[PDB]
Write a protein that binds this DNA or RNA. Structure first.
Lengths: 161, 382, 239, 122
RNA sequence: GCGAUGAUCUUGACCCAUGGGUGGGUACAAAUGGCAGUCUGACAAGU
């Protein structure tokens, strides 16, 4: 029965990526206002969104007291030492907390959307291995499911020559 | 003999006039709150803490003839109980011009690099305190957020169409009855399959007359049945849709406090979204207050008005005022004149909220302006 | 084809050639909207490993917006404005020309923006948040003893004042912060001082007070009619 | 109002209201901050007249800024009842603009009043 | 230890005595790109 739901899965996944990038540019702008150094230091969306999410302060974001660089990354990473270096030379804007809470909502959207694309990817590889094992042996999941999304069905693809 | 006035503490210079381009004593201040009150102290002529400590520590050999630069500090030290002989002669002095020349070399742990950075960040904060506001005068985040809210509507609509489409296989007969996407989503998020129909989850969502069509339609719909994993993806995505539907309302709640805070009279007249589209379509409040009320009435649909000016035909009399409820309440023959009154008083409320007197006072005059609008509103309907 | 931009007889002052004849300085904080200006990206063709050679960005600059551009386009060889020097920029009056001073002073100089009014400082702080080399202060420039704490010492002084007591206003400042054999560039607007009379007597009494406060004007001239009733003075204090 | 500057003394007030009166006779006048604003956007104004007793004042504080941008003369007048009176209006008018006419017969009076304003602004 | 269960050959386009210059589709960013000069301006109602 996975002739159409997998097309919903892959096109919905592209929708998830394009929607993630939209808020991601906004949050990187916002933390560009408060602390301009780390936003140019970490181009990642999810982890940097958590880095904005846990602390909201540019004078107490360290690897120890407090631990936000020992929670996901390690303190022996070259990124974390540059967070220690950038935390001293800060010149950014001091803004209120109510403005930051809206961006905490945004980081919660980032973690949510990240969870749904992970679950969608696992369901994607799972059902692609289910309904079409041999094409997953040849050209994998993404290209084969893409070509099914071109033909619309396994039957239409089975009729093309 | 020499008092040094700078944002790194206060120093006594005897270089121990007998001077060898060195220092006699230094008493150190360095922080943001210290240099803030020191920046207050040079303006006020105010004696600081390390000025009193510098009068207290060194005495009787380097302070009997003290030369201070300010005339204000000469009288404060002149009234000290230690009885110093203090003058303010030779302020414009090459020595006094030269104490800043060896200033990285006479202060340990400092150089010319951190002095411009500390003076820069001090200049930001004293610019915040003197101008009694922020260092950017930020209002653009409302303009960004109102651009994001329609994106929430479009993306939430997109995912609503999605879950509509790959729910229609199992139970096709719901879109003909239930068209609202939230009521579409919460039924599946509570129920799941059609074979687990109950009463309470329908009762919290729908009226009874819709619920009976839902139940009898659930009897006669014989769509597909499949494994629980796809159903888990359905409850996941439905949780996501209700989640985002709460999030856009949280965004409107964020725009509530900012719109009430920054533009109170505009909030009183048209509320939040209309004036948000006014400032957003204009670009800024300060250029819009420079724009007259004739531009304010025609704000929006620039190609239609510019087309009406090229063709010299009937001008569109509807801009962003086309969606106001008090304006939409009136008939079209009487709508444009009331919109002229509302744009006319609206320009007055923009010139209220623009010039930094109602941001600190939260607005009291647009309350009278709404009454003046409603009076003429009653009169034109007569 | 593209234009080529080659330096004038000063440092940091670059002239465009030839289908565009415009005066440009080095950009150091791109993406700005000072007045809705356009920017010019030029580079040197080079074949190297890794990244391409750098597009050294230049921003357009008019004599219709600054007297300093007019003083260079009128023909100038000596100037105390160069990358690396510390300048005292007396008055700003919009905040827009401060970015041009920050561009012509290079990344090594520090621009001290002096203001005595509340209204144009709101543009000064927002300009200062973008460019991390401009220090704005809202201070009383009549008394150098009331703002000696925030500023250090400058290499040259630019005066944009046009007040009838300006020779007092610079003097206690030039006695304080300007070094010996440092340079003064003073923009004098003749009709702004007095307009009931000609300007040559004003020029004589003002250069006489420049003789009084030990200023040596190496060259004083009417600019050319790009501006009206103005003379700029390049001199040296205690030469 | 500490913000009410520059303001006209009574003799120049009578002179200016006479010139406004004759320009209203010669159909050379704009009333309201809307019409004066639009003439400032068109660059067709000779000079600007504003009332200093206009409560509130924030509806016209932008006009000195725009006249400083366009180099347009302006002096406040301390009365709005007299200002609407000289407009031939039975209401207090607070803002007026003098439209450009190089063929006007009272243009020498306009140049004299502009000499008074350029005297007061410097 | 060759293939009709496709062997075999062709739709990257131009040029220069591995190297070098153009051409087209996608995305992002920016507009001395488009806005004669971003509406008209004192009357209306009633007896």
């Amino acid at each position: 029965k996975n002739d159409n739901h997998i097309i919903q899965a892959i096109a919905l996944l592209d929708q998830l990526d394009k929607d993630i990038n939209t808020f991601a540019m906004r949050v990187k702008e916002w933390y560009g206002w408060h602390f301009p150094e780390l936003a140019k230091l970490v181009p990642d969306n999810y982890t940097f969104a958590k880095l904005v999410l846990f602390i909201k302060d540019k004078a107490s974001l360290n690897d120890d007291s407090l631990h936000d660089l020992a929670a996901l990354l390690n303190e022996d990473s070259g990124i974390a030492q540059r967070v220690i270096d950038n935390a001293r030379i800060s010149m950014g804007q001091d803004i209120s907390e109510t403005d930051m809470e809206n961006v905490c909502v945004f980081a919660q959207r980032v973690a949510s959307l990240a969870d749904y694309r992970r679950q969608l990817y696992d369901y994607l590889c799972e059902k692609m291995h289910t309904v079409a094992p041999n094409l997953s042996e040849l050209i994998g999941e993404v290209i084969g499911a893409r070509l099914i999304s071109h033909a619309g069905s396994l039957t239409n693809l089975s009729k093309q020559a | 003999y020499v008092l040094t006035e700078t944002s790194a503490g206060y120093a006594l210079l005897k270089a121990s006039v007998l001077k060898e381009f060195k220092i006699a004593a230094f008493s150190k201040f360095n922080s943001a709150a210290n240099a803030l009150e020191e920046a207050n102290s040079i303006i006020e002529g105010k004696v600081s803490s390390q000025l009193e400590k510098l009068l207290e520590e060194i005495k009787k050999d380097k302070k009997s003839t003290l030369i201070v630069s300010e005339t204000k500090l000469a009288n404060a030290i002149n009234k000290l109980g230690l009885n110093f002989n203090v003058v303010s002669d030779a302020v414009t002095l090459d020595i006094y011009r030269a104490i800043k020349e060896y200033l990285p070399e006479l202060l340990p742990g400092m150089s010319d690099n951190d002095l411009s950075k500390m003076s820069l960040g001090l200049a930001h904060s004293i610019g915040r305190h003197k101008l009694k506001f922020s260092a950017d005068k930020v209002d653009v985040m409302i303009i960004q957020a109102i651009a994001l809210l329609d994106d929430l509507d479009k993306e939430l609509n997109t995912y609503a169409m999605r879950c509509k489409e790959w729910y229609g296989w199992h139970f096709p007969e719901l879109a003909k009855i239930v068209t609202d996407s939230v009521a579409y989503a919460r039924i599946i998020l509570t129920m799941g399959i059609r074979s687990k129909a109950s009463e309470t989850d329908l009762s919290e969502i729908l009226p009874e007359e819709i619920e009976e069509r839902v139940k009898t339609a659930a009897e006669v719909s014989m769509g597909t049945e499949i494994t629980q994993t796809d159903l888990d993806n359905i409850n996941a995505l439905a949780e996501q849709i209700v989640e985002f539907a709460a999030y856009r309302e949280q965004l409107s709640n964020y725009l509530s406090a900012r719109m009430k805070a920054i533009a109170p009279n505009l909030t009183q007249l048209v509320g939040e979204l209309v004036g948000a589209r006014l400032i957003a379509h204009s670009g800024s409040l300060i250029s819009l207050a420079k724009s007259p009320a004739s531009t304010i009435q025609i704000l929006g649909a620039e190609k239609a008005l510019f087309r009406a000016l090229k063709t010299k035909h009937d001008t569109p009399k509807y801009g962003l005022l086309y969606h106001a409820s008090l304006v939409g309440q009136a008939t079209g023959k009487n709508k444009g004149k009331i919109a002229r009154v509302l744009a006319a008083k609206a320009a007055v409320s923009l010139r209220y909220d623009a010039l930094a007197e109602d941001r600190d006072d939260s607005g009291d005059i647009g309350l009278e302006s709404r009454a003046k609008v409603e009076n003429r509103l009653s009169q034109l309907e007569g | 084809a593209k234009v080529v931009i080659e330096p004038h007889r000063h440092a940091g002052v670059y002239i465009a050639r030839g289908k565009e004849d415009l005066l440009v300085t080095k950009n150091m904080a791109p993406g700005e909207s000072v007045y809705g200006e356009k920017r010019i990206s030029v580079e040197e063709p080079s074949k190297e490993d890794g990244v391409p050679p750098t597009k050294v960005e230049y921003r357009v600059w008019n004599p219709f917006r600054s007297k300093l551009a007019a003083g260079i386009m009128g023909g100038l060889d000596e100037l105390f404005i160069a990358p690396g020097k510390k300048v005292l920029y007396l008055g700003a009056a919009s905040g827009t020309s401060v970015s041009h001073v920050s561009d012509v002073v290079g990344p090594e100089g520090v621009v001290y923006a002096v203001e005595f009014s509340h209204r144009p400082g709101r543009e000064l702080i927002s300009m200062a948040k973008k460019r991390p080399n401009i220090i704005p202060i809202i201070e009383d420039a009549r008394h150098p003893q009331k703002y000696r704490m925030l500023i250090g010492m400058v290499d040259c002084v630019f005066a944009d004042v046009a007040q009838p007591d300006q020779a007092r206003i610079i003097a206690l400042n030039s006695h304080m912060f300007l070094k010996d054999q440092g340079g003064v560039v003073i923009s004098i607007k003749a009709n702004c001082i007095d307009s009931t009379v000609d300007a040559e007597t004003v020029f004589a009494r003002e250069v006489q007070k420049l003789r009084e406060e030990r200023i040596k004007p190496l060259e004083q001239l009417t600019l050319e009619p790009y501006e009206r009733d103005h003379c700029i003075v390049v001199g040296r204090y205690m030469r | 109002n500490p913000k009410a500057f520059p303001l006209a003394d009574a003799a120049l007030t009578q002179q200016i209201l006479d010139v406004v009166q004759q320009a209203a006779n010669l159909r050379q006048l704009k009333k309201g901050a809307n019409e004066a604003t639009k003439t400032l956007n068109r660059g067709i104004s000779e000079f600007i007249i504003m009332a200093a007793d206009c409560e509130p004042i924030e509806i016209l504080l932008h006009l000195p800024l725009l006249c400083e941008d366009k180099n347009v003369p302006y002096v406040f007048v301390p009365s709005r009842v007299a200002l609407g009176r000289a407009c031939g209006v039975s209401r207090p008018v607070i803002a007026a603009s003098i439209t450009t006419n190089d063929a006007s017969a009272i243009k020498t009076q306009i140049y004299a009043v502009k000499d008074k304003i350029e005297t007061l602004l410097i």
